[PDB]
C-alpha cells in the first residue's frame, strides 16, 4: 500500500536464561534499542493517523516506553530470579517469551497491531540492538506458535510501569473490546 515508518527508542535490561548445558551461563543484557515501526495505510483517515500529541501514537508510545528503564523477564523463569527481578526494578515487565531483540520485534509488532483497533496495518517491526544487530518481524512471525504465542494477557506490566501511562486503563481497555479513538 503506502509505507509509513515511525521511529521509537527505549533503554532496557532483560534476562536470558540458560540451558542445563554445563557451559551455558545466565546473562543480563542492558542495551540501547531503536525501533522501526513499519505501517501500511490504505486510508489516511484521522482516527488511525499516527503523529505526536495525538491519541493513537500516544498509546503506542506509552506501551513502547513501558520497556524503557524497565527489566524484562520470562514468565517461566525460576521464581527466585523473578522475585529478585521485582525487587531489583519497580519497572518490570513479565513476558510470555524469553526477552530478546528477536522477541521484542514480535512483541512490539503485536502491541502496535492490537492498538490499531480504534486501512492502517502493522507491516513489520525492526528492533536494532545497540551496534550489534537487528531483528525484523513480519506478520507470519507473530502467529508463529513455534516462536511463542502472543496474547495481551501474557504481557504483564508493573504497577510503576502503569503509573507513567497517560491512561491507567489503556491496556485493560484493549483486553476488552474497548475501541480507542471514537
Amino acid at each position: 500500500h503506502m509505507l509509513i515508518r515511525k521511529l521509537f527508542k527505549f533503554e532496557n535490561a532483560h534476562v536470558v536464561r540458560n540451558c542445563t548445558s554445563d557451559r551455558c551461563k545466565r546473562s543480563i543484557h542492558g542495551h540501547s534499542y531503536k525501533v522501526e515501526l513499519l505501517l501500511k495505510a490504505s486510508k489516511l483517515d484521522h482516527g488511525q493517523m499516527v503523529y505526536d500529541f495525538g491519541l493513537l501514537k500516544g498509546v503506542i508510545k506509552d506501551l513502547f516506553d513501558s520497556f524503557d528503564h524497565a527489566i524484562c523477564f520470562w514468565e517461566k523463569d525460576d521464581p527466585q530470579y523473578i522475585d529478585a527481578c521485582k525487587t531489583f526494578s519497580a519497572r518490570w515487565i513479565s513476558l510470555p517469551v524469553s526477552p530478546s531483540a528477536e522477541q521484542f520485534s514480535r512483541i512490539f509488532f503485536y502491541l502496535a497491531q492490537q492498538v490499531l483497533q480504534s486501512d492502517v496495518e502493522v507491516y513489520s517491526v525492526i528492533v536494532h540492538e545497540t551496534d550489534t544487530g537487528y531483528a525484523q518481524s513480519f506478520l507470519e512471525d507473530i502467529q508463529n506458535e513455534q516462536m511463542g504465542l502472543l496474547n495481551l494477557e501474557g504481557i504483564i506490566f508493573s504497577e510503576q510501569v502503569q503509573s507513567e501511562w497517560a491512561d491507567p486503563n489503556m491496556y485493560e481497555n484493549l483486553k476488552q473490546g474497548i475501541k480507542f479513538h471514537n
Copy 2:
C-alpha cells in the same frame, strides 16, 4: 526503467485538527522535512532532464519551496482557525487534505507528476519528518480517493508564496494545458 532520486528539503508548520473525542486535542507541528523524489526515465531528452539552473527542476523546486516557511491548513478546517492561519503567516497553503508527512508525500508526488508535462515519470516520493519517521507515496496512493483526491485547484498557494516564484503564472499555467519546456 532507470531510477533517478532527487533530494529536496523544506521547513514547515502545519495543523492537525482533532476529533470530537474528549481527549483529542488540536496540535501544530513545526518540523524539518526531507524529500526524496524518485523518478523513472525511459529517455533522457533535454526537455525532461532535472538539474540545477534548468527550467524544469526550477519549477519543481519553486513548488516544493512553497511549503518552506509556510503554514499548511486543511480547506475544511474551522474558518476561525483558517483566518487565524492567514493572519499568522503571509506564507500559507490551503490543502484539500489535512496536512501531514503522509499527505505531503502524496501532494509532492502529484505536484511533480503534474509538472512533468512539458519517458520521465514520478515513481515515488518519500517525506522524512525530522527524526521521527517517513511516509512513502506510490502511484496507487495518488489516485486513492479514500486518501483524498488531489487536483491542482485544491491546493491554494498564498500571494506571498507566489511572490517568490520565478514565474508568477507557473501554477496557473499548469491549471491550463500550457506546456512548460518548449
Copy 3:
C-alpha cells in the same frame, strides 16, 4: 572541571517580525560543569532533576513561540492557533532559544550551566555562555516574562513546578 553534556530535541514554530514564520527541528546540547556529584543536583533520566529540565525543554516542542512586544492582535492569532504557546520576553530565535534554555536550566539548578548549544535544522547553531545571559542589550531574562500556556503547563509532571520556581521552593 567535570564536563557533562546532556542532549535534548524539540520541534518548534515561532515568529519574527516580510514577517516570517519558522518551523524547525531543534537540537539542544546543555553543557554543565560539576564539582560535587551529590544526588540532589544529579542529571539523569527517570529521576527528578532532569525531569524538571526536560519538562521545561519539551515545553517548547509542538508549541508556537512569540514575543511579548509583538503586536497584540497577532498575539491572539498566535494563541488562537494552538493551545501550546509560550510567551517569551525576547523575540524567539535560535539565538534567543540558547539564552532562554540556559536561563531555565540555570534557575533549576555544584552543577552550574556552562553553555547551551541550540542547533536550528541544518543551517547551523547558536551557543550561549553565561555572559550572553547577563546582557540587557540581548534582552534581559527573568522568569515571569517567560509565560507558558495552560496546556503547555498541562503536560508537565508537576503542573505547578514553574510557579514553584519563581518562589523560594
Copy 4:
C-alpha cells in the same frame, strides 16, 4: 604532547536510588598523553597493556553495577540477578563511570591518562579529568572498593590481574 585516543564500548545495567534501573549502551574515549613511546607502556590491541585495560573495561559489559552503600537486601537482589556484577565505591552513573574508568586506566599505567569521556546512549556524556579523580566530594576512589564478581573475574586473560594490581606487581 602526543594525544592518543583509544575507544571502548560496553553494555551495562546499573542502579540509582522512585529508584530507577538503567540499561544503556556506553562508549568510552580514553584520552592519553605520551612522551616516551617505550614498548612496555604501549597501548595496542593484541599485546598486553591494552589487554589489561580492555579486560577491566569489558568487565562492565553485560554486568550490573551497584553501590557499596546501597541497602544490603537489594545488593543480594543485585547479585542474585546475574553473576556478572561489579561492586562500586560510588553510586554508578555515567558521571561516575568516567571517574572509575579513569582511575582503573591510571592505576594500570610515560603514558598518563589525560581524560575519559563516557557517552551514555544518545543522551550525552560525562568527561572526567584528573582533578575530578582527586575529589572526596565526588567520592574517593581506591582500588579495593571496586569489587568485581567471581564470574566477571573469570573472563579475564589473567583472572588474578586485579589482585596483582593492588600489590606492587
Copy 5:
C-alpha cells in the same frame, strides 16, 4: 548471482546545453561524484577479480579517474563552446551524449562492461551527484537508443587524460579485440 559493490569517486565539471526556449540558459556543473559499481559474479577466477594493485581494477580506475579534474562536453555542442572547453581544460572528455549524472551512470556502466572482457558482469552503476541525488543505470538503460547509443569510439579522452593512464594504449586496446588480463 553474488553481489559485489565497488566504490569510486571523481570530481568533475560538465556542460549542459540549452533549448531554443527563451528562458532556458546554458549551465556548467562542478560537483563531487560518488560511484557505486555493482557487479554480479558467477565465478571468482583470478582474471576477473577486482582489487587494488591488480590490473583489472587498475584499468577500471584509470578510465573512471579520466573524468576527475576533467571537463565533459557533448560532441554535438556548438564548436565555439567545444573549442573554449579545450582551451579551458587540457583534461577534457568528448561524450556522445550530453553530460549528466544520469549519463555518467550509463557511461561508467558501459566502460566497466567493456573492460570486463579479459562470470563477472556489470549489474548496475549508481552515480551520486553531491548531496542532490543519484542516478542508477541498469543493463536496459545501456542499450536504450532513446537514451543515446554508447560506443567506445564516441567517448574521446584528451591527450592529457591519456597522459595519466598506467597504459597509454588501454582504450585503443579495447577498441580492438585485445584481451586484457592473459
Copy 6:
C-alpha cells in the same frame, strides 16, 4: 561571546595555473560572534541580512571562478564557457574561498565575522580568521576586485546590492 555558526553549500568550478581545473562540492561554515542581537544585524533565513549573505555566497554556485591576473585569452575562454563567472582578485582555491567569503560577509555586516571554514569535497578544509584577511602576502581583498558576472548578478534578490555595498548605502 555568543558563537553563531551558519552553514552554506555551493558547487563550483575554478582554475589554477600542468594547469588544472577543479570541480568540487563545497561546504561553508560561517562563524560569527555576537553581543547585541539587535534585529538589523540578525542572521535568519527568510528575512534580509542573511538574504544578502546567502545571495553573495550562492553567487559561487554553478559558476566558474578565475584570477584577474590569469592570462587574458584564457579569461575569455573562462567566460565564453558560461555566463555564471566571478572574477577574483586572487587565484581561486578553497584557501582563497575562505578568505573571500570572510571578506564578503564582513563587508555586509554587533555581529562580526570570527572565522570561515570552507570544506573542499572530502579532501579537507581551509579556515580563515581575521588576520588572514589582513595579509597583502595572501593577496589583498577589496570589494571591486571581486567582479561577479551579469548573470550571477541576475539571480540576486536585488541585482544592485553589490553596487550598493561599494558605496555607503
Copy 7:
C-alpha cells in the same frame, strides 16, 4: 522467514597471488573488515538463539575473530611464500581459496552455516572491505564449485589462532558430528 542481522568486525592481512602475466604483481592487503551475518529464523528456541555471553554466538565469534590480526593465504600458493607467511605471523589461516573480501563472505557464510548444527539458517553474509566496497554471499555462492568448494578441513587455523578459542576443540568438534548446544 524472520530476518536477523548480526554485526562482526575484524582486522586482517591477506595475499592475492598473481598471473604469469607480465604486468600482474603480487599484492598484500591489510584492511578493516565489517561483517553482516544475515539469519532467517523460523523458531526462536534457546539452542539457536544468537546473543552475547551465550555459547552459540561465542563459537561464531571465536571462528570469526580467528581472522583478526591474522594473515590469510591460499593453500596452493608457492610454498616459499607460505613459509614466509608462517614466519611473518603466528596467527595464520590456510584457505582453500585465494583470500578476498569476495571469498571471506563465502567463508564466513560457510563457517556460520556449519556452526548452526546444535529453524535458524544463514541467509547471507556481507563483508565490507574498508571504504572500497562489499561482497555479498548467498547460499548458491557457497555450493558453487566454480567459486571453490568449501569444506571444514580446507580451512586450517594456526596453533596461536586456536590458542585464543574459548574451546580448543571447537573446530575439530564440528569436523566430527559433535553437536554443540545440548
Copy 8:
C-alpha cells in the same frame, strides 16, 4: 593563522614484536598553518606539492612496515612477503605513523606542518605535534632511516623524488 586540513587514507600491514601483525585501514588528517599562500607551497590535488605528499603517504598503502631493529631473519620474511615494504627507523604503530607522516610532510615543505592525526580503524587515533618529532626518547627521525622498497618507489610520479629530498634539490 590559517588552518588547513588535508585528508589522506591508506591500508597498511605492519609488525610489533606474542608478536602481533596488524592489518588496518588508516585515516590521516594533515594539519597545516599558512601565512603566505604563495603558489610553490600550495597544497592542491592535481598540481605538484601535494603530489609529493600524497605519493609519500600512499607509499604506506598496501605495503607492509617493519622496524630496522627487528631481527634480520624476520625482516627477510617481511620483504619476501611482498615487494611493497617500507623499512622504518622506529617500530611501526599508529603512534609512530603520526610522527613519520609529520616528518615526511615537514621535509617536503610559509606552510608548516602543525599536527598530524592518524586514525587506526575504529579503535582511536594518535595526534603528533612538532614537539613529538623532536624526541630522541620517541625515536629520532631522519630521512635515510625510512627506506621505501623498490616497488613502492616504482609507483611514484618521480621515482627519484625521495633521493632528491635527502639532497638540497
